[PDB]
Design a protein around this ligand. Structure first.
Ligand SMILES: Cc1ccc(C(=O)c2ccc(O)c([N+](=O)[O-])c2)cc1
Ligand SMILES: Cc1ccc(C(=O)c2ccc(O)c([N+](=O)[O-])c2)cc1
Lengths: 116, 115, 115, 116
């Protein structure tokens, strides 16, 4: 599994469960093509977005639907979503974990990149 | 000044100077229309982006060109840019500060919204 | 003003107002000696803690009383306080801003050190 | 394992390996008594600090030796250490993960608390 997303909730001190995530890849025409999507599990993790064969070099956007997450909890947050945009696999295949820590008016995101 | 952007560097413990910032406003057809832009000052701040008259309710995107910032320092970074997408709402307080704290493989962002 | 402390609230998107802040300086016997204290202003800032004459090189601790802040808002928080421990060094730039961004179960802190 | 520590490096986009961690517990005389210590593994994680029986209610301080970590890499950082101070187990036993994301002039820390 070459792309994993993990989301934490800084208000509750818990995994952020049921967070929708949409991944896009920049196409040759420079538009954002839908690539994969899913939701975080009870551990805050989202596995199985893609395969090593399909996850080719390119520019990818991971959109974490933070507003939908906070609104489903009956909280009015600031951001629409958190967007994480990066070039992947340009030095050969890597494994990427995109992590995010959410509050209603703030978030932080980090990447852990490993070479299998 | 209804919108200010502040950028900080977590590697050097300093303002992030001469960072390009582009602001867009979501149009009726869901595209992003250029709205305002500039470069951060020696204090890491970008003032003067817009006016109260122009900054109507709607969805805005602030794009911070972090990749060029790190490369100018001779550092290889992870992200293409940092993006902050939010709704401006007239019910809340009137002044928006979008702050970003940058590292090569991470960033955080907060909003400080005051009267 | 060689040392300033700024505190922000990530739940409400605001300065963290009336937060108690205590600064200590490490003594020769490794204990923490009271050095300066105050409460953050309506802007989330605490100015005036010390003077250039008094702020000599050494190890300092800034303790931010986050638990009382959250409880006054009716929120149950994780940490007893936030602590920032650092060395003041005359070789580096002269002005230190210690910034903290607070959530109930998390906080971040950065240093912005400038001339 | 009721207390785990995870540390990430925001400059390299990797686990922070070989980070020393010292845990203290406030004693009846209000001093900080040494409680447990260890170092992060190649995954950035530190397991096995304590046991459910020994990890009683109290106020605990987790000291993450960030300066020692950056200096071992030949980097001059700002902070001496990151200190995480919290009351544990006051509503019965819980499992705590203390996470930290490190940069030379900044860090963020979060807690994930679960009820077994
Ligand atoms: C159990 C666990 C806890 C924390 C993390 C983590 O990666 C993490 C910790 C603090 C953070 O501010 C961010 N972030 O996204 O910026 C990520 C990962 C796993
Ligand atoms: C108006 C203003 C807003 C933010 C900051 C700032 O320094 C800041 C911004 C984002 C952060 O995650 C942190 N932090 O403590 O980790 C600090 C400084 C000034």
């Amino acid at each position: 599994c070459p792309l994993m997303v993990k989301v934490l909730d800084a208000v509750r001190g818990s995994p952020a469960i049921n967070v929708a995530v949409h991944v896009f890849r920049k196409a040759a025409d420079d538009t954002w093509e839908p690539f994969a999507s899913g939701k975080t599990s009870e551990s805050g993790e989202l596995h199985g977005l893609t395969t090593e064969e399909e996850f080719v070099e390119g520019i990818y956007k991971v959109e974490i639907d933070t507003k939908s997450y906070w609104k489903a909890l009956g909280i009015s947050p600031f951001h629409e979503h958190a967007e994480v945009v990066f070039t992947a696999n340009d030095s050969g295949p890597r494994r990427y974990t995109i992590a995010a820590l959410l509050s209603p008016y703030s978030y932080s995101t980090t990447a852990v990149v490993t070479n299998p």
